Structure 1
Amino acid sequence: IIIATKNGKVRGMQLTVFGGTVTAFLGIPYAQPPLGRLRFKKPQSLTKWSDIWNATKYANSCCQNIDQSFPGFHGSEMWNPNTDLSEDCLYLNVWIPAPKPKNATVLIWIYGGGFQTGTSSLHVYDGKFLARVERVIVVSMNYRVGALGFLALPGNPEAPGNMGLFDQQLALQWVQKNIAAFGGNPKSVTLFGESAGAASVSLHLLSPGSHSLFTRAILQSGSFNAPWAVTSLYEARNRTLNLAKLTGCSRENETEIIKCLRNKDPQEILLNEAFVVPYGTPLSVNFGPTVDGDFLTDMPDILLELGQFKKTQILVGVNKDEGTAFLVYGAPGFSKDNNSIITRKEFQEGLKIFFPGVSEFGKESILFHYTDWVDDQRPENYREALGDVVGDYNFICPALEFTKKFSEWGNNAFFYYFEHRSSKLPWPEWMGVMHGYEIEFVFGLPLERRDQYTKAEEILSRSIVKRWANFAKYGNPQETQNQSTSWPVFKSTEQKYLTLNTESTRIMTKLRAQQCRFWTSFFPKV
């Protein structure tokens, strides 16, 4: 029941899963609370305790604005925090198999949410199933989001940038010093994350301070080279200063500004974070990762291009309809409550939403590449086009470009294309296979027979969980026993990927090839 960690003893709880027993250590601190003077600074090493910490409830989530676009709707509220918001939020969770493992592979989860929001305590991140069914140890951590986690005055240690990334990294260090006490193999750690979490995992591949803290990496619908993923030192400053004006903290001494923002309450900082950008989109990362010179020593697209990353295996993939969810967060003519058939004029007005500071020619060039119809009278044409535009530009093509460039340095890479729509999905059907809705299959929620998934879904979760755990254990996401389709390596030439669905699991080649040539070779010029 009690584990001795290097900072003190922690007590866990017992959980019944699938006629077995999993041990959960929920809410173990991994750093001093970043309060007061420590607000905006890097996380600080935690002082020993001599009690027994009761890691028996999820700890506080980090301060964050909440999605209030669909109050009472489960499809949006299931992602909102489900513990108290607090600045005291640097805690982590450990799920160990019971009976205690001997030398188990560790899976470390990093949640997404645009670097502004998220919490490990979400129901779709519950690692008890993975512990039970695969005998891996699952770790997740809370890390600071928004300006409290990524406010940047570059060079200044009072607000150096990337604090939330350093939070994550301090958690990975925690696993290194402590997971062996829990039966875990620190030499066998896989990071996996989704969206901003997956872009975080991709940055830990780049950051030299993380290189000895994990073995392998899984990237779900997200990578650092996505257009929302990194903030420039320019914008980071303009946004750090805009926040200072919006709170009356404008000073001539940069360090005095920070001191001033420390005496503001978390809600005052949260309430002004949206306005630091003049034109925002539904994909607006107001305070995100930056090239700080510490966690990130150069611009990441240059490190990628020139082979400057941890050499190891990666499992990368995306969902079929990544971009549809964002259309009801602002695009004209759209609603989760009608079919959202839009017009050519409605489509064009929607590009101005998602590409605000882009030239008229750039927006015309998006329209041109995405409105050459297989049928001009199909009434869903513009509705589906804009979703693909958002999805290809923001997730699918950056994920493919990352895998391409990363594999070019001789490491095994595996790409998937998740194309199964959940049977219990509360969103409308024109939204398809939405951004974020593989996560429950990865965590094995369809395995519980008691929550109204179909049988075909339990099998698909079962296969995904096996492949995921075989990747973590053996760098190879195969399912070797049940005559499963073999998952080939992704190579720069042939570009083979695995489709994930409940019908046929197929080997295909060169995903969204025509669309990504536009986004990756042309559009970065405009």
Structure 2
Amino acid sequence: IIIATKNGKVRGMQLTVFGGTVTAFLGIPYAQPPLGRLRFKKPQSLTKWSDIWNATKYANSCCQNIDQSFPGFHGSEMWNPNTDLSEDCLYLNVWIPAPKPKNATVLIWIYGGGFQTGTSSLHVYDGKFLARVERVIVVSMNYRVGALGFLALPGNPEAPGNMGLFDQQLALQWVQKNIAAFGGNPKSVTLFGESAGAASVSLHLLSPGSHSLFTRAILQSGSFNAPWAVTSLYEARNRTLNLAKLTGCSRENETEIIKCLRNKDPQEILLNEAFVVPYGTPLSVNFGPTVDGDFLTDMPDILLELGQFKKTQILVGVNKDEGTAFLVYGAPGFSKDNNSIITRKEFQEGLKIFFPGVSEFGKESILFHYTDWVDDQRPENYREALGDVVGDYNFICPALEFTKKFSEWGNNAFFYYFEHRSSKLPWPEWMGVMHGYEIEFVFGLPLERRDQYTKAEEILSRSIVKRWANFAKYGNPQETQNQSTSWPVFKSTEQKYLTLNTESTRIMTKLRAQQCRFWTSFFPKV
């Protein structure tokens, strides 16, 4: 089966899914390979081809450093690239239902990974289940990460910043020009993403050049106002310079620095990325979105606060234990291979790791607000508190504050709190409902009865998949047939949200109220 696109013909492949068929187009190029003279620049439009492009395998993943903290462990290694790294990585995938749809809603996935890592080819991003089950079209794209995707010399078009975001945007563009040929409705496009993918989605809501490239948006465990999601022009330029020094590329002509960085091998840029921040951490967003005056015209907190964003519906949510995963990537006394009971002094040391440039008073105030124990003697008190600190600060309270503020400008918003721990989760139990482990439910992996998910999990994924698809098609994430709890609109006053679990889906109000008044109202002053 061959589809004629604006740039040439592309050949796909047939997939058997649940006694049905899905047509997959894996690895369609959507931009000139950003190579040589093109490294660090915005993505350039693709010159047509005459032949038939074979889009039958995932393309190259973009260059990136790899998580090597747990070699051989599926809990970490399932997130690492599963295709060759290359700078030639600006490709996208398309899953379409078979038989070919007539006017199908399109779902576009944007992966996370702190803007330093990630790839669309991961097993948990397989769109074939959504296409089969809900008859939507699923699109995902690779986008540049790290310095190669977000190196910033603001104003300088040789390295303007936000290239990876313009990569995402050129892909949304491609869907607008082409998806009708695949049976998709370019007027019914829902972006969805997780973590840095969700922050990306929220920034497309703010960027005028994306306003007309999509309809609705879903934000899973991420938003641009998260403290890790936007690099300051101060940090960015200090980081660009440190990368220059580290590679022998320091110059006075800012443009000649870039020319110098353009001759370095991709691996020399990767090696030196970690050290551009003196507070070196494997959790460091070394190179991320900036206020570039192109993609972002202003500081996004101002745009959010003053209503300068796309007026549409959003679906936003978080997981119960967003913070735990990060505790084994540097916090003292923590291990995935034991229950990580930590002392007060280990907790205090963990705050220093996660809040590096923060005053002593700032850290004491975190301790004060998170160590008023319901029981003094519980040995896991400090271990649980540090997880909640990292998750509330980095994910939950920014997503809640994003939703309140977005909804105050009159748009329907829906907030969820995912609290199911996957029965297959390879990480230990004290880690709970981890960051990233709703994704397989969203993509319908538990719908495949053959892979050891329980029956309760099949049903939960089935409902979630239905709610996501109804949100994308109809702006309203209900499951209307199986006497399901109705999902209320999130309002700035009521703050109602829906819990997602295998047992009882219920309606609650004002998630982490006390914790988020601390993080959102007080802590930004310290």
Q: Is the contact between residue 282 and residue 326 of structure 1 (CA under 8 Å) also seen in structure 2?
A: no
Q: Identify unmatched segments of 5+ residues in structure 1.
A: none
Counting aligned pairs with the same residue, the percent is 100
Post-superposition Cα deviations, 1:458-511, rounded to whole Å, max 9, x if no partner, equal 000000000000000000000000000000000000000000000000000000
Q: Is the contact between residue 318 and residue 395 of structure 2 (CA under 8 Å) also seen in structure 1?
A: yes
Post-superposition Cα deviations, 1:186-213, rounded to whole Å, max 9, x if no partner, equal 0000000000000000000000000000
Distance 2:512 2:388 in 1: 10
1:442 Cα shift? 0.1
Q: Matched residue of 2:82: which SS? A: coil
Post-superposition Cα deviations, 1:42-70, rounded to whole Å, max 9, x if no partner, equal 00000000100000000000000000000
Post-superposition Cα deviations, 1:211-258, rounded to whole Å, max 9, x if no partner, equal 000000000000000000000011100000000000000000000000
Post-superposition Cα deviations, 1:361-382, rounded to whole Å, max 9, x if no partner, equal 0000000000000001000000
1:4 Cα shift? 0.1
Distance 1:502 1:243 in 2: 48
Post-superposition Cα deviations, 1:350-404, rounded to whole Å, max 9, x if no partner, equal 0000001000000000000000000010000000000000000000000000000
Distance 1:371 1:33 in 2: 51
Q: Is the contact between residue 206 and residue 309 of structure 1 (CA under 8 Å) also seen in structure 2?
A: yes
Q: Is the contact between residue 282 and residue 354 of structure 1 (CA under 8 Å) also seen in structure 2?
A: no
Distance 1:456 1:434 in 2: 19
Distance 2:30 2:329 in 1: 35
Q: Is the contact between residue 217 and residue 313 of structure 2 (CA under 8 Å) also seen in structure 1?
A: yes
Q: Is the contact between residue 446 and residue 453 of structure 2 (CA under 8 Å) also seen in structure 1?
A: yes
Distance 1:293 1:347 in 2: 40
Distance 1:39 1:492 in 2: 44
Q: Is the contact between residue 151 and residue 287 of structure 2 (CA under 8 Å) also seen in structure 1?
A: yes
Post-superposition Cα deviations, 1:9-67, rounded to whole Å, max 9, x if no partner, equal 00000000000000000000000000000000000000000100000000000000000
Distance 1:287 1:467 in 2: 34
Q: Equivalent residues in 2 for 1:251-330 (5 A)?
A: 251-330=251-330
Q: Is the contact between residue 231 and residue 290 of structure 1 (CA under 8 Å) also seen in structure 2?
A: yes
1:281 Cα shift? 4.1
Distance 2:262 2:282 in 1: 28
Distance 1:20 1:56 in 2: 19
Q: Is the contact between residue 421 and residue 432 of structure 1 (CA under 8 Å) also seen in structure 2?
A: yes
Match of 2:138 in 1: 138
Distance 1:282 1:395, change over 3 A: farther
1:283 Cα shift? 3.3
Distance 1:401 1:386 in 2: 21
Q: How many residues align?
A: 526
Match of 1:388 in 2: 388
Distance 2:485 2:355 in 1: 40
Q: Equivalent residues in 2 for 1:47-446 (5 A)?
A: 47-446=47-446
Q: Matched residue of 1:353: which SS? A: helix
Distance 2:449 2:70 in 1: 29
Post-superposition Cα deviations, 1:107-126, rounded to whole Å, max 9, x if no partner, equal 00000000000000000000
- Find out whether 1:447 has 2:463 as its counterpart: no
Q: Is the contact between residue 97 and residue 135 of structure 1 (CA under 8 Å) also seen in structure 2?
A: yes
Q: Is the contact between residue 209 and residue 295 of structure 2 (CA under 8 Å) also seen in structure 1?
A: yes
Q: Is the contact between residue 281 and residue 356 of structure 1 (CA under 8 Å) also seen in structure 2?
A: no
Q: Is the contact between residue 362 and residue 523 of structure 1 (CA under 8 Å) also seen in structure 2?
A: yes
Match of 2:488 in 1: 488
Q: Give the TM-score taking structure 2 as reference length.
A: 1.00
Greater Cα shift, 356-365 or 272-281: 272-281
1:144 Cα shift? 0.1
Distance 2:394 2:235 in 1: 19
Distance 1:94 1:164 in 2: 20
Q: Is the contact between residue 191 and residue 214 of structure 2 (CA under 8 Å) also seen in structure 1?
A: yes
Q: Matched residue of 2:449: which SS? A: coil
Distance 2:271 2:283 in 1: 18
Distance 2:254 2:123 in 1: 41
Q: Identify unmatched segments of 5+ residues in structure 2.
A: none
Q: Matched residue of 2:427: which SS? A: coil
Distance 2:253 2:359 in 1: 37
Q: Is the contact between residue 323 and residue 435 of structure 2 (CA under 8 Å) also seen in structure 1?
A: yes
Distance 1:408 1:515, change over 3 A: same
Q: Is the contact between residue 274 and residue 282 of structure 2 (CA under 8 Å) also seen in structure 1?
A: no
Distance 1:268 1:77 in 2: 23
Q: Matched residue of 1:27: which SS? A: strand
Post-superposition Cα deviations, 1:392-440, rounded to whole Å, max 9, x if no partner, equal 0000000000000000000000000000000000000000000000000
Distance 1:388 1:443 in 2: 27
Distance 1:282 1:381, change over 3 A: farther
Distance 1:474 1:486 in 2: 15
1:269 Cα shift? 0.1
Distance 2:234 2:72 in 1: 39
Q: Matched residue of 1:450: which SS? A: helix
1:284 Cα shift? 1.3
Q: Matched residue of 1:25: which SS? A: strand
Distance 1:170 1:350 in 2: 40
Post-superposition Cα deviations, 1:260-319, rounded to whole Å, max 9, x if no partner, equal 000000000000000000113453100000000000000000000000000000000000
Distance 1:466 1:350 in 2: 40
Distance 1:233 1:62 in 2: 24
Post-superposition Cα deviations, 1:129-162, rounded to whole Å, max 9, x if no partner, equal 0000000000000000000000000000000000
Distance 2:26 2:366 in 1: 46
Q: Is the contact between residue 223 and residue 402 of structure 1 (CA under 8 Å) also seen in structure 2?
A: yes
Q: Is the contact between residue 109 and residue 192 of structure 1 (CA under 8 Å) also seen in structure 2?
A: yes
- Find out whether 1:517 has 2:517 as its counterpart: yes
Q: Matched residue of 1:524: which SS? A: helix
Q: Is the contact between residue 319 and residue 433 of structure 1 (CA under 8 Å) also seen in structure 2?
A: yes
Q: Matched residue of 1:523: which SS? A: helix
Distance 1:280 1:467 in 2: 40
Q: Is the contact between residue 416 and residue 500 of structure 1 (CA under 8 Å) also seen in structure 2?
A: yes
Distance 1:22 1:263 in 2: 43
Distance 1:266 1:388 in 2: 37
Distance 1:431 1:414 in 2: 26
Distance 1:229 1:371 in 2: 27
Q: Is the contact between residue 273 and residue 286 of structure 2 (CA under 8 Å) also seen in structure 1?
A: yes
Distance 1:282 1:345 in 2: 23
Distance 1:37 1:236 in 2: 22
Post-superposition Cα deviations, 1:82-115, rounded to whole Å, max 9, x if no partner, equal 0000000000000000000000000000000000
Distance 1:481 1:162 in 2: 43
Match of 2:18 in 1: 18
Q: Is the contact between residue 192 and residue 198 of structure 1 (CA under 8 Å) also seen in structure 2?
A: yes
Distance 1:403 1:282 in 2: 29
What is the root-mean-square deviation of aligned Cα atoms in Å? 0.4
